[PDB]
Design a protein around this ligand. Sequence first.
Ligand SMILES: COC(=O)N[C@H](C(=O)NN(CCC[C@@]1(O)Cc2ccc(cc2)C/C=C\CNC(=O)[C@H](C(C)C)NC1=O)Cc1ccc(-c2cccnc2)cc1)C(C)(C)C
Ligand SMILES: [Cl-]
Ligand SMILES: [Cl-]
Ligand SMILES: [Cl-]
Lengths: 99, 99
Amino acid sequence: PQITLWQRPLVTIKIGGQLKEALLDTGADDTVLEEMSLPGRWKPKMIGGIGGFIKVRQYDQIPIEICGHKAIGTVLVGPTPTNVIGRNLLTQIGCTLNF
Amino acid sequence: PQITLWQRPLVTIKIGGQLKEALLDTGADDTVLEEMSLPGRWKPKMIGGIGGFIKVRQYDQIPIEICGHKAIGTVLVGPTPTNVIGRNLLTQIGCTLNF
Ligand SMILES: COC(=O)N[C@H](C(=O)NN(CCC[C@@]1(O)Cc2ccc(cc2)C/C=C\CNC(=O)[C@H](C(C)C)NC1=O)Cc1ccc(-c2cccnc2)cc1)C(C)(C)C
Ligand SMILES: [Cl-]
Ligand SMILES: [Cl-]
Ligand SMILES: [Cl-]
Protein backbone atom coordinates (compact mmCIF):
# COMPACT_ATOMS: atom_id res chain seq x y z
CA PRO A 1 0.00 0.00 0.00
CA GLN A 2 0.79 3.68 -0.08
CA ILE A 3 0.16 5.14 3.36
CA THR A 4 -0.55 8.87 3.68
CA LEU A 5 0.90 10.86 6.59
CA TRP A 6 -2.01 13.25 7.02
CA GLN A 7 -2.98 11.00 9.92
CA ARG A 8 -0.95 8.77 12.23
CA PRO A 9 0.02 5.66 10.27
CA LEU A 10 -1.73 3.02 12.38
CA VAL A 11 -2.00 -0.60 11.29
CA THR A 12 -3.24 -3.89 12.65
CA ILE A 13 -0.61 -6.37 13.74
CA LYS A 14 -0.94 -10.01 14.68
CA ILE A 15 1.45 -11.17 17.39
CA GLY A 16 1.40 -13.93 20.01
CA GLY A 17 -2.09 -14.89 18.86
CA GLN A 18 -3.35 -11.36 19.56
CA LEU A 19 -4.51 -8.52 17.29
CA LYS A 20 -3.20 -5.08 18.20
CA GLU A 21 -3.03 -1.61 16.66
CA ALA A 22 0.42 -0.09 16.24
CA LEU A 23 2.15 2.95 14.78
CA LEU A 24 4.53 2.61 11.80
CA ASP A 25 7.48 4.58 13.14
CA THR A 26 10.52 5.29 10.94
CA GLY A 27 12.09 7.18 13.86
CA ALA A 28 12.18 4.07 16.03
CA ASP A 29 15.14 1.66 15.98
CA ASP A 30 13.10 -0.97 17.82
CA THR A 31 9.55 -2.31 17.95
CA VAL A 32 7.94 -1.67 21.34
CA LEU A 33 4.58 -2.91 22.57
CA GLU A 34 2.51 -2.43 25.71
CA GLU A 35 2.58 -5.17 28.33
CA MET A 36 1.76 -8.60 26.94
CA SER A 37 2.98 -12.17 27.23
CA LEU A 38 5.43 -13.64 24.72
CA PRO A 39 7.07 -17.08 24.74
CA GLY A 40 10.76 -17.88 25.09
CA ARG A 41 13.81 -16.20 26.58
CA TRP A 42 14.11 -12.48 27.27
CA LYS A 43 16.60 -9.98 28.66
CA PRO A 44 16.10 -6.49 30.10
CA LYS A 45 16.81 -3.36 28.06
CA MET A 46 16.58 0.39 28.55
CA ILE A 47 15.27 2.39 25.62
CA GLY A 48 15.14 6.13 25.27
CA GLY A 49 12.97 8.68 23.50
CA ILE A 50 11.56 12.10 24.18
CA GLY A 51 11.09 12.31 27.95
CA GLY A 52 13.85 9.83 28.82
CA PHE A 53 14.12 6.07 29.23
CA ILE A 54 11.93 3.10 30.09
CA LYS A 55 12.82 -0.48 30.99
CA VAL A 56 11.51 -3.17 28.67
CA ARG A 57 11.82 -6.91 28.13
CA GLN A 58 13.57 -7.90 24.91
CA TYR A 59 12.24 -10.99 23.09
CA ASP A 60 14.06 -12.22 19.99
CA GLN A 61 12.85 -14.19 16.96
CA ILE A 62 9.16 -13.36 17.41
CA PRO A 63 6.81 -13.95 14.46
CA ILE A 64 4.61 -11.00 13.57
CA GLU A 65 2.20 -10.13 10.77
CA ILE A 66 1.84 -6.49 9.70
CA CYS A 67 -0.77 -5.69 7.06
CA GLY A 68 -0.71 -9.28 5.82
CA HIS A 69 3.07 -9.17 5.61
CA LYS A 70 4.82 -11.82 7.69
CA ALA A 71 8.12 -11.10 9.40
CA ILE A 72 10.22 -12.20 12.34
CA GLY A 73 12.24 -10.06 14.71
CA THR A 74 12.91 -8.62 18.12
CA VAL A 75 9.97 -7.23 20.07
CA LEU A 76 10.37 -5.11 23.18
CA VAL A 77 7.60 -5.19 25.77
CA GLY A 78 7.01 -2.66 28.54
CA PRO A 79 5.32 0.55 29.66
CA THR A 80 5.34 2.35 26.32
CA PRO A 81 2.55 4.91 25.97
CA THR A 82 1.78 3.55 22.51
CA ASN A 83 2.53 0.50 20.39
CA VAL A 84 5.24 1.25 17.82
CA ILE A 85 6.57 -0.77 14.89
CA GLY A 86 10.22 0.19 14.41
CA ARG A 87 12.75 -0.13 11.63
CA ASN A 88 13.79 -3.66 12.62
CA LEU A 89 10.44 -4.94 11.33
CA LEU A 90 9.63 -2.22 8.79
CA THR A 91 12.63 -3.37 6.70
CA GLN A 92 11.30 -6.92 6.59
CA ILE A 93 7.98 -5.91 5.02
CA GLY A 94 9.82 -3.76 2.49
CA CYS A 95 8.59 -0.44 3.86
CA THR A 96 10.18 2.71 2.42
CA LEU A 97 9.80 6.47 2.72
CA ASN A 98 9.13 8.20 -0.59
CA PHE A 99 8.94 11.85 -1.66
CA PRO B 1 13.99 9.90 -3.15
CA GLN B 2 13.19 6.44 -1.86
CA ILE B 3 14.65 5.85 1.60
CA THR B 4 14.97 2.34 2.98
CA LEU B 5 15.08 1.72 6.70
CA TRP B 6 18.08 -0.52 7.27
CA GLN B 7 19.75 2.53 8.79
CA ARG B 8 18.24 5.57 10.54
CA PRO B 9 16.61 7.85 7.98
CA LEU B 10 18.84 10.83 8.71
CA VAL B 11 18.77 13.72 6.29
CA THR B 12 20.22 17.20 6.09
CA ILE B 13 17.88 20.09 6.83
CA LYS B 14 18.44 23.82 6.57
CA ILE B 15 16.92 26.24 9.05
CA GLY B 16 17.97 29.81 9.81
CA GLY B 17 20.68 29.51 7.17
CA GLN B 18 22.33 26.59 8.97
CA LEU B 19 22.61 22.92 8.04
CA LYS B 20 21.65 20.28 10.59
CA GLU B 21 20.99 16.53 10.61
CA ALA B 22 17.49 15.33 11.41
CA LEU B 23 15.55 12.07 11.56
CA LEU B 24 12.50 11.51 9.36
CA ASP B 25 10.00 10.19 11.90
CA THR B 26 6.56 9.03 10.85
CA GLY B 27 5.81 8.24 14.51
CA ALA B 28 6.03 11.92 15.42
CA ASP B 29 3.08 14.30 15.05
CA ASP B 30 5.37 17.32 15.39
CA THR B 31 8.88 18.44 14.45
CA VAL B 32 11.21 19.02 17.38
CA LEU B 33 14.75 20.33 17.21
CA GLU B 34 17.55 20.60 19.75
CA GLU B 35 18.14 23.98 21.41
CA MET B 36 18.64 26.75 18.86
CA SER B 37 17.60 30.34 18.22
CA LEU B 38 14.56 31.19 16.13
CA PRO B 39 12.86 34.53 15.42
CA GLY B 40 9.63 35.92 16.76
CA ARG B 41 7.41 34.93 19.64
CA TRP B 42 6.91 31.40 20.90
CA LYS B 43 4.07 29.59 22.65
CA PRO B 44 4.22 26.77 25.18
CA LYS B 45 3.69 23.13 24.30
CA MET B 46 4.04 19.88 26.19
CA ILE B 47 4.85 16.88 24.05
CA GLY B 48 4.91 13.22 25.03
CA GLY B 49 7.38 10.56 24.00
CA ILE B 50 8.29 7.03 25.05
CA GLY B 51 9.90 8.29 28.25
CA GLY B 52 7.28 10.83 29.31
CA PHE B 53 6.67 14.53 28.70
CA ILE B 54 8.85 17.54 27.96
CA LYS B 55 8.13 21.25 27.64
CA VAL B 56 9.15 22.84 24.36
CA ARG B 57 8.98 26.23 22.67
CA GLN B 58 6.62 26.37 19.68
CA TYR B 59 7.55 28.63 16.76
CA ASP B 60 5.11 28.95 13.85
CA GLN B 61 5.56 29.60 10.14
CA ILE B 62 9.30 28.86 10.08
CA PRO B 63 11.02 28.21 6.75
CA ILE B 64 12.86 24.89 6.72
CA GLU B 65 14.44 22.89 3.89
CA ILE B 66 14.33 19.10 4.23
CA CYS B 67 16.54 17.16 1.80
CA GLY B 68 16.32 20.20 -0.46
CA HIS B 69 12.52 20.31 -0.29
CA LYS B 70 11.07 23.62 0.94
CA ALA B 71 8.60 23.68 3.83
CA ILE B 72 7.27 26.44 6.10
CA GLY B 73 5.67 25.37 9.34
CA THR B 74 5.71 24.78 13.04
CA VAL B 75 9.00 23.93 14.69
CA LEU B 76 9.28 22.95 18.37
CA VAL B 77 12.54 23.56 20.21
CA GLY B 78 13.58 21.72 23.38
CA PRO B 79 15.54 18.93 25.04
CA THR B 80 14.98 16.22 22.47
CA PRO B 81 17.45 13.34 22.13
CA THR B 82 17.74 14.06 18.40
CA ASN B 83 16.35 16.45 15.80
CA VAL B 84 13.13 14.90 14.48
CA ILE B 85 11.05 15.82 11.45
CA GLY B 86 7.45 14.85 12.14
CA ARG B 87 4.31 14.50 10.07
CA ASN B 88 3.50 18.22 10.06
CA LEU B 89 6.46 18.77 7.70
CA LEU B 90 6.64 15.31 6.11
CA THR B 91 3.22 16.09 4.59
CA GLN B 92 4.52 19.40 3.20
CA ILE B 93 7.30 17.63 1.28
CA GLY B 94 4.96 14.93 -0.08
CA CYS B 95 6.25 12.01 1.96
CA THR B 96 4.44 8.69 2.11
CA LEU B 97 5.16 5.22 3.44
CA ASN B 98 5.10 2.44 0.84
CA PHE B 99 5.38 -1.34 0.90
C1 LIG C 1 1.62 12.02 19.67
O1 LIG C 1 2.80 12.45 20.35
C2 LIG C 1 3.91 12.27 19.58
O2 LIG C 1 3.86 12.33 18.35
N1 LIG C 1 5.09 12.08 20.18
C3 LIG C 1 6.29 11.83 19.38
C4 LIG C 1 6.92 10.47 19.76
O3 LIG C 1 7.64 10.36 20.76
N2 LIG C 1 6.34 9.43 19.13
N3 LIG C 1 6.61 8.32 19.49
C5 LIG C 1 7.26 7.60 18.39
C6 LIG C 1 8.71 7.25 18.73
C7 LIG C 1 9.56 8.53 18.68
C8 LIG C 1 11.04 8.19 18.46
O4 LIG C 1 11.18 7.64 17.14
C9 LIG C 1 11.84 9.50 18.55
C10 LIG C 1 13.21 9.25 18.67
C11 LIG C 1 13.86 9.48 19.88
C12 LIG C 1 15.21 9.18 20.01
C13 LIG C 1 15.94 8.73 18.92
C14 LIG C 1 15.29 8.51 17.71
C15 LIG C 1 13.94 8.83 17.57
C16 LIG C 1 17.30 8.39 19.03
C17 LIG C 1 17.61 7.91 20.31
C18 LIG C 1 17.54 6.55 20.62
C19 LIG C 1 16.78 5.64 19.87
N4 LIG C 1 15.39 5.63 20.37
C20 LIG C 1 14.36 5.11 19.58
O5 LIG C 1 14.67 4.69 18.46
C21 LIG C 1 13.02 5.34 19.99
C22 LIG C 1 12.28 4.01 20.28
C23 LIG C 1 10.77 4.23 20.30
C24 LIG C 1 12.63 2.93 19.25
N5 LIG C 1 12.29 6.19 19.00
C25 LIG C 1 11.50 7.26 19.42
O6 LIG C 1 11.31 7.43 20.63
C26 LIG C 1 5.38 7.58 19.84
C27 LIG C 1 4.66 8.21 20.85
C28 LIG C 1 3.38 8.69 20.58
C29 LIG C 1 2.59 9.20 21.60
C30 LIG C 1 3.10 9.30 22.89
C31 LIG C 1 2.76 9.85 25.22
C32 LIG C 1 2.31 9.84 23.91
C33 LIG C 1 1.06 10.36 23.61
C34 LIG C 1 0.24 10.86 24.61
N6 LIG C 1 0.67 10.82 25.94
C35 LIG C 1 1.93 10.30 26.25
C36 LIG C 1 4.36 8.78 23.17
C37 LIG C 1 5.12 8.21 22.16
C38 LIG C 1 7.26 13.00 19.52
C39 LIG C 1 8.61 12.65 18.92
C40 LIG C 1 6.68 14.21 18.80
C41 LIG C 1 7.45 13.34 21.01
CL1 LIG D 1 15.22 -7.73 14.86
CL1 LIG E 1 15.30 -3.44 0.67
CL1 LIG F 1 3.04 22.99 10.58
